[PDB]
Design a protein around this nucleic acid. Structure first.
Length: 265
DNA sequence: CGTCCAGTCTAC
DNA sequence: TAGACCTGGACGG
């Protein structure tokens, strides 16, 4: 996921787990090379929040939960294939690498971090990855100033479609989003980042870095395969017939119309 | 069958 | 940076 997927997952966790109570340990799959989660509680609630391409779960024990314990936070990055699912306890998906189990009475469910390709990671702190800029979805004003007040940075030397994946500055922006955003303004992908942003020191590029991911979040769907049909209709550029497409210098495909721009490999 | 396609993260 | 890290779906002999 990119920002909208992390945001929708955080919403899913909060809605699904709102009236659930978990107990037991946090079971990690043998196959997963991420950390064991050292947390056991007779009774705990799960909640989520998102910031850019990161999701923080908090495990919060109830009054009286044994053993006595402070709440524990985990931060996930999803990679290419990461998702949350709430399934029956006996019918865990293939590639569920982290499971939290409901306590009884009522049906015995499992909240699972499911990650086919195992690119997703998690950490025992609750701290956002330092270096990551403000969330384009929830911290717009901070994200926007953080760009304009650092155009001198060597990252803005690169073409605009490469800078747009720099998570120090576009925390939440992924491959489909850079395609869709530039297509709305018809900005050539291999225009020089500093030149495109100096030109605004009309929704502009930084406004669309907020508003376009927001359009995806308001669509809902995406696991939270039917409300993928809507999303695939929503795309105007990325992967769409009669669209130009090159590799950026890190070998990532950028979709666009017409003029590729001055720095085009 | 077979090949190619879909965000970090860390060590050269 | 450039390569590694993984699985499954899509498309082609």
């Amino acid at each position: 996921g990119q920002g909208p997927e992390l945001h929708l997952a955080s919403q899913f966790v909060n809605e699904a787990c709102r009236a659930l109570v978990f107990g037991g340990c946090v079971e990690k799959s043998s196959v997963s090379r991420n950390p064991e989660v050292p947390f056991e509680s007779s009774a705990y609630r799960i909640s989520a929040s998102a910031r850019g391409k990161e999701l923080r779960l908090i495990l919060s024990p109830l009054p009286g939960a044994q053993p006595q314990q402070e709440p524990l936070a985990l931060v996930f990055r999803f990679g290419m294939s990461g998702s949350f699912q709430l399934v029956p306890r006996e019918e865990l998906p293939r590639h569920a690498h982290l499971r939290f189990y409901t306590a009884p009475p009522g049906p015995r469910l499992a909240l699972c971090f499911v990650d086919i390709r195992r690119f997703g990671r998690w950490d025992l702190g609750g701290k956002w990855q330092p270096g990551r800029g403000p969330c384009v979805l929830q911290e717009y004003q901070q994200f926007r100033e953080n760009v304009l007040r650092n155009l001198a940075d060597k990252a803005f030397d690169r073409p605009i479609c490469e800078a747009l994946l720099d998570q120090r500055f576009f925390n939440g922006i992924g491959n489909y989003l850079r395609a869709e955003i530039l297509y709305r303004l018809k900005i050539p992908p291999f225009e020089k980042a500093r030149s495109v942003l100096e030109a605004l020191q009309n929704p502009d590029l930084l406004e669309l870095c907020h508003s376009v991911p927001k359009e995806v979040v308001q669509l809902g769907g995406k696991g939270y395969e039917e409300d993928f049909a809507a999303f695939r209709a929503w795309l105007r550029c990325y992967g769409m017939p009669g669209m130009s497409s090159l590799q950026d210098r890190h070998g990532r495909t950028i979709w666009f119309q017409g003029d590729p721009g001055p720095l085009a490999p």
